Design a protein around this ligand. Sequence first.
Ligand SMILES: CC(=O)N[C@H]1[C@@H](OP(=O)(O)OP(=O)(O)OC[C@H]2O[C@@H](n3ccc(=O)[nH]c3=O)[C@H](O)[C@@H]2O)O[C@H](CO)[C@@H](O)[C@@H]1O
Ligand SMILES: CC(=O)N[C@H]1[C@@H](OP(=O)(O)OP(=O)(O)OC[C@H]2O[C@@H](n3ccc(=O)[nH]c3=O)[C@H](O)[C@@H]2O)O[C@H](CO)[C@@H](O)[C@@H]1O
Lengths: 157, 157
Amino acid sequence: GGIDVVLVTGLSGAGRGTAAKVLEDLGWYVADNLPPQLITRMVDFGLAAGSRITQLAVVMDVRSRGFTGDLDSVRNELATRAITPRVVFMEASDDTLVRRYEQNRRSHPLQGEQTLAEGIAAERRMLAPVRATADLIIDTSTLSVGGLRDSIERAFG
Amino acid sequence: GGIDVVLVTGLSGAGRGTAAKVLEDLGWYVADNLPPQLITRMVDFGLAAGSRITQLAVVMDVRSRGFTGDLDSVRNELATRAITPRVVFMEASDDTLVRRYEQNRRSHPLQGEQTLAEGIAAERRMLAPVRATADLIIDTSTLSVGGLRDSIERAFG
Ligand SMILES: CC(=O)N[C@H]1[C@@H](OP(=O)(O)OP(=O)(O)OC[C@H]2O[C@@H](n3ccc(=O)[nH]c3=O)[C@H](O)[C@@H]2O)O[C@H](CO)[C@@H](O)[C@@H]1O
Ligand SMILES: CC(=O)N[C@H]1[C@@H](OP(=O)(O)OP(=O)(O)OC[C@H]2O[C@@H](n3ccc(=O)[nH]c3=O)[C@H](O)[C@@H]2O)O[C@H](CO)[C@@H](O)[C@@H]1O
C-alpha cells in the first residue's frame, strides 16, 4: 500500500516503451515485460526496506507470459496489499501503427500466420476489454516523442 | 538448467535496450530492469510448464535495484539451478555516447548534479570489473541499428 503502481499496456507500436522511458525520466522505477504472475513478487520487493521502491511502473502487454488481456487477477492480488494500480493504455490509428512498423522494419508480435494488418486487428480485439478499464488512454497517432513527453508529464506531474 | 539465460548490461546509451529488442526479434523472452534478487523468481517461473520459457534475456544495469556493479550473487543463484548465464556488455566511445544523449535529450542515470561526461566516466568506473567477466562485448561506436541486428544475429542466431 506504500507504493504507487502504474501498469503501461496497449497496442504494439503505439509507444509503450517510449511512455515507459518518460516515466523513468520522471523518477519512476520501470520494469518491462514482467509476467503477470510475478507482479506480487515485484511489489513485495519494492516494499522491503533497503530495496525500497515508492513509484513502480510495469509494462505488461501481448508479449508478457500469461497475459491474456485481463488485469483482474493482477488487480485482485495487488488489492490484498492495499494497492490499486493506475492503468495507462497506449493506442494509435491503424495507419500510424503500420507506418511505424514500416519505418522500424520490426515484426508485429501477432504477425506470422497472419499479416501485419491482421496482427494489429487481433491485438485490438484482445485488448478492447482491458482498454475500457484504463485510467488514461493516450492516442499517439500524431504525437511526436516530445508531445508524448508533455502528455505524460501532465498526468504524472 | 532447462532455460538459456542471457544478461544484457553495459554503458547507458551504448544500446542495451536496442540489443534486447534484437534478441526479442529472434524469439527470446526479454525482461528489462529486473532487480538482481528477482532473477531467481523469473527463472523458476520460466521452468514451470504452462509458463515455459526456453530462452530468457534480462537487461540489468545501473538502473536495477540492488545492482552494485557485480554479477556475483546472480551467477551464484543461477548456479543453484544448473544455469550458466551468458553476459553481453554494450559499450561505445565517449563521443558516441555524448552524441546519443544530445540527440535523444535524456539525462544520464549517474549524472546527478554533475555533467554528462562525469556521469559516463562514473559508469565506466562502476562497470569495468563486470565488463571483464562478460562473454561478449559489443562496441556500438559506429554501428547502426541494422549493424547491431547483424552482430547479435551472428552471435545468437
Ligand atoms: C513499431 C514498433 O517498434 N513496435 C514495437 C515497439 O512497440 P512500443 O509500443 O513499445 O513502441 P515504441 O515506444 O518503441 O515506439 C515505436 C515508434 O513510435 C515512435 N513514437 C512513439 C510514441 C509517440 O507518441 N510518438 C512516436 O513518434 C517512437 O519514437 C518509435 O519510433 O516495441 C515493442 C517492445 O519491443 C514491440 O513489441 C513492438 O512490436
Ligand atoms: C542515450 C540514451 O538514450 N540512453 C538511455 C538508453 O540507453 P540504452 O543503452 O538502452 O540505449 P538505446 O538502446 O535506447 O540506444 C540509444 C541510441 O543509440 C542508438 N543505437 C543503438 C545501438 C547501436 O548499435 N546503434 C545505434 O545507433 C539507438 O537507435 C538509440 O538512438 O535507455 C536506457 C533505459 O531507459 C537509459 O538508461 C539510457 O540513459
